[PDB]
């Protein structure tokens, strides 16, 4: 998750706090996951062979 | 009280709205609280908690 | 606020909430993902 986020405390009631989201530091960049293309292709090929 | 006019600062007479048995009605009740159990809300010294 | 998926993913939101005393409501605000809020009416201003 590339970006830093800032928290905020809001008093729900007696001794209760609700941590909400304040803002995003810097330009917004979407989160993502990286998987090696060759390794994943090999794994999918193997499971395809087994399914065949 | 009459004796106060004559450590009476140790207590305060606090009146607040209390919910009755019906959730849509409130009753202005009163009670006496020790000053050690209440703190001011503002700096105006009229409203406590 | 985005430079320009992640642009519409979030929403400013202002609401009222109970304080530590259950007779006073305080106007607060926060940032909510659009996946966590559902529009109430069709005018696109009130959510929940």
């Amino acid at each position, epitope marked *: 998750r590339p970006n830093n986020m800032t928290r905020k405390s809001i008093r729900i009631g007696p001794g209760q706090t609700f941590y909400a989201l*304040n*803002d995003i530091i*810097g330009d917004i960049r979407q989160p993502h996951c990286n998987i090696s293309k060759e390794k994943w292709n090999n794994t999918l090929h193997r499971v395809w062979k087994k399914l065949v | 009280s009459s004796s106060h006019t004559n450590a009476m600062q140790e207590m305060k007479n606090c009146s607040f*709205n209390m919910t009755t048995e019906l959730r849509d009605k409130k009753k202005k009740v009163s009670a006496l609280f020790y000053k050690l159990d209440i703190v001011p*809300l503002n700096k*105006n010294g009229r409203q406590y908690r | 606020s985005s430079s320009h998926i992640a642009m519409q993913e979030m929403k400013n939101c202002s609401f009222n909430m109970t304080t530590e005393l259950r007779d*006073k*409501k*305080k*106007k607060v605000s926060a940032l909510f993902y659009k996946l966590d809020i559902v529009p109430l009416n069709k005018n696109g201003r009130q959510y929940r």
Partner: antibody
Amino acid sequence: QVQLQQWGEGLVKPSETLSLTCAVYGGSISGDYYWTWIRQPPGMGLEWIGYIYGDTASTNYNPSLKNRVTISKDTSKNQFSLKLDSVTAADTAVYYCARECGGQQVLHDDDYDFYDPTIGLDSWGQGVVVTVSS
Amino acid sequence: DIVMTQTPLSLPVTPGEPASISCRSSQSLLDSGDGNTYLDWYLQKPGQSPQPLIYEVSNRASGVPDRFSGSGSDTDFTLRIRKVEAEDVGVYYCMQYTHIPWTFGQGTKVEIKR
């Protein structure tokens, strides 16, 4: 918000009394508002002078000037004024009258009794230049 | 009296880049009476009355663009401008009103860098 139009005498002799007035338009001076006076010395940062509460007559002043400042309000004319006695050259500044929304606005026929708008000094006057010179 | 330290005292920023102003207090600003952190941010544009920017740490004022946004817990507070524009030049003050007297910061003079 509220329009605050202020006037007064911008030129006072040393050891005299500075009298400024701030008029409130578009709102009521009686309420849960802290009517504040703030001055900015030429070239320096802002400095807080004091305030007078809207509902009661509770006033708070800067401890450095607590023995000279007196802030009063006139609900009939919807105005509040500042009086500063024994002025010196250190009292030359630009004086702004502001309004700080309090945190216990009274709510009528609602589920709650009070309401905290989470608002500070939302209204500011245009400022009055005050020069303490003989 | 709470002493309110603002850093930097001068912030030259070119439009398009983020800017950050930090403000610290000698005491915790968490009001004990009602639990509100009373810290405000104000912007005094050149030759104009101060105007509200942020109320109570994070609650943005009315009419203030989305780029301005404050934060901080009880003693370290930060005002961030996501994308500085040529109309953001001015002096920024952090004011506390938890304790009497209300004390402003030194004031950060935001200017244009060339």
